[model samples]
Target: EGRAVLTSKTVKDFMLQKLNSLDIKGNASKDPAYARQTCEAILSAVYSNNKDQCCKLLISKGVSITPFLKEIGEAAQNAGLPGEIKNGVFTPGGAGANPFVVPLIASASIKYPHMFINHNQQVSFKAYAEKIVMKEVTPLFNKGTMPTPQQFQLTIENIANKYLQNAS
Candidate 1:
């Protein structure tokens, strides 16, 4: 086996070069704008179901998918889409419902089995809140029929909070 060495400076320089070539607007190479652009790009890809582009951008840049996960959900909310489960089961709620509630509860059941299995187990509202808001929702919106981002986010938060309160 052979090994090569790389330092932070080397990686930084490499990233700077790559970022420069990408032509991200303004000081995106060295500022928070880079994250915003990446998030928006990933969201665009997700909305269009272009998984190849999404995965490529994420993988090539070695970006942590955590922060962008929230943006993904926000984008889904903005588009008035619902979440998708592994079993292809979706919530029966109508257009005004928080699309993530059913899927999030299902996921929580698996992720925190003790909470379901043992009646005494106290569920984590924080964990559920972050999960539902970030990763539970998915793309299922009809093209050209989304609401304003502020309205969509507020609507989703209202519904999600209601369900969480009931569950707790």
Candidate 2:
């Protein structure tokens, strides 16, 4: 590499604001958990089954598919199969396997908001709340996930449908 360079503070501040809009906290020097939370939030916000933005956001958050694959391998040793896999499978080759899958993380979150932190429950049950909600919303992908822009529109429609259906 030519040189190691630091990002400008102004640029970082702007990025922080962008991250905050997506509910990601950008102050990492305070605590590692802050970075982790911020990363997860960013991942939740930016995930797109499409390879380009999906991989870019994940790499920016320091998450690589390889590590995910590795972790799943370890998890599979103790468990039968990764529950996430059961709900939605990742397609191989290119970044655009399915743009629809990426948007669903945030879409479902909005449709059925769940706590992201793990304070009271045990480690195993920490993500249990979200898992329960995910089961209901992810079946839509069986018909093939929509693009990111359409996902947002569908999310709005899905929420409205629920409200209208429930209304007296």
Candidate 3:
């Protein structure tokens, strides 16, 4: 069921829509070579299950990072995995064992450190975290079978640690 959901025509269509909505500009967006490269990158990212690579490829291909993150954040929120702070760390909760949330969080952390540093913008983090959890985790589990709260906490911590390590 989980595998089918990821490969369904609807998923492909939605991915295409998200790709199209990206703010790709200049020659890269229109060039076949660039398109091919981007597709290859996306494929590789998916094949390897590498969210960081996906984020990097999208950024390299001229997708506007801020809006893209915002979109992702919105999606996370809709997924019911909004962000929270526990011990001065940004923790994304609600869903569990998502393959994509880590990358989204890492990308946002790398691209907009201010969002994490400024307490005033905590809401932004919550929204972004929610979006990631919803979009990436919710589809993978049935009701009441999601990861435990402890597991979710550990996942968020690991993601945060990874982001911090890479940031340095």
Candidate 4:
């Protein structure tokens, strides 16, 4: 028994509709716990799989994924993703880094603009990502090896939640 072809666009549309049906309203917690929940749920699929498709959905749904892209690209560089990987403009896309990574950062920034954008949009993502690359990622992971998507997720969630906690 096998399912037929499921176009990536179709998949995104399906998930997009699902999000509308499951909206989180006002009065969400401001604590780190809510941040954890936010990271776990909103960023789930892309961080796990369906990299391009997931963000396409987010894009169509009115979430601008640009801000996070800048952050991710820089993080990739500072985190030691290879000069060649992030050197030229759009080079990262041609060679690509981690598909799992590409989507979540965008969605989260939109979903929780509080942590992503700062006072009058001063932009905190640049500083925020550096912290993770320094302590949360390199030193913790040890050596120069790629941490699997889930591993990235665990540490990323921690950093994101921490960011969110201080966001208020």
Candidate 5:
């Protein structure tokens, strides 16, 4: 009885169970209905002129994934899912779990570049947003692609996780 490892699979499995346990209890906070609604709304923005309205809208809706952002993100990175280290950036290799995710988050990164508080000075908001845009988002909404409801809120958490992961 010493400690627990923090690998990606462990992190993912642990979080999934945590989410499941929440659903079983009355005190749980995983609101799939709200998550579905927000995902739908974000998709709406994805197809509309307000495509860049995701991060804030997701935040405004108060999606409950903030609690898991760090772990899930670390897991996503560890699983070698999408955001691989490249060109001094997180994502430059492939499309993450959801293709729509990049475009969705990219919109906000481009529109509201300054949203990042920049607690870690290694990478400023501008550089981060620009690279994500030019390398990740820009390639999509043009290349072969396709896309989630409850799954999306988690994606937001994953993306947001990487956003913060860079700082640490």
Candidate 6:
């Protein structure tokens, strides 16, 4: 027997609708928790495995799936994902770096705007990280010697510490 799952597009439409539904306003830094919560509610609905219903709805809206995933990660993370979960972003090619995973992080930011804003500094750190990934990590991958998650975490931690200390 086989079970059906929701198409990615359907989930995307549901999420977009939910976002449009929010009457939220105010500095994200001040009310991040609520922002994150609102995002989470939307993500929870979108990530569902309901294929038939979701596919039909998505086809109607013509939405894409990539942004939807990222939005979910952003939302979930913003909704207070905790320190332990924060480091889960280094998983070679899983939900970690995928643009679709942003919602989880976005969600975390919504719940704890300060913390979200703090770690959200990932934007600034991104260029530097990308350079390192390209120059260092990519070569290592080419040689089949990619770092373990712990190793990658250390590298990220070091970069974060340095960035924080050097912030203007």
lDDT of 4 by residue, 18-134 (tens): 333322211123334432333232223212122232233444555533333333333333333322332342112222322222332344345445444655221223222222222
The order by descending lDDT is: 3, 1, 4, 5, 6, 2
The whole-model lDDT of each prediction reads 0.34, 0.29, 0.34, 0.32, 0.31, 0.30
Q: What TM-score would each prediction reach against the true structure?
A: 0.24, 0.20, 0.24, 0.27, 0.20, 0.20
Work out how many backbone clashes candidate 5 has: 0
RMSD, candidate 6, Å: 20.6
Q: Residue 94 error for model 5, in Å?
A: 6.5
Q: On a 0 to 1 TM-score scale, where does candidate 1 land against the true structure?
A: 0.24
What lDDT, from 0 to 1, does candidate 5 have?
0.31
Q: Looking at candidate 1, what is the lDDT of residue 106?
A: 43
Better of 5 and 6 by TM-score: 6
RMSD of each: 16.9, 18.3, 18.0, 16.8, 17.8, 20.6
Q: What's the C-alpha lDDT at position 63 in model 1?
A: 49
TM-score, model 3 to reference: 0.24
Residue 73, model 6, lDDT: 33
Of 3 and 4, which scores higher on TM-score? 4
By lDDT, the better pick of 2 and 5 is 5
Per-residue lDDT of 3-28 in model 5, one digit per residue for the tens?
25544333223323332332322221
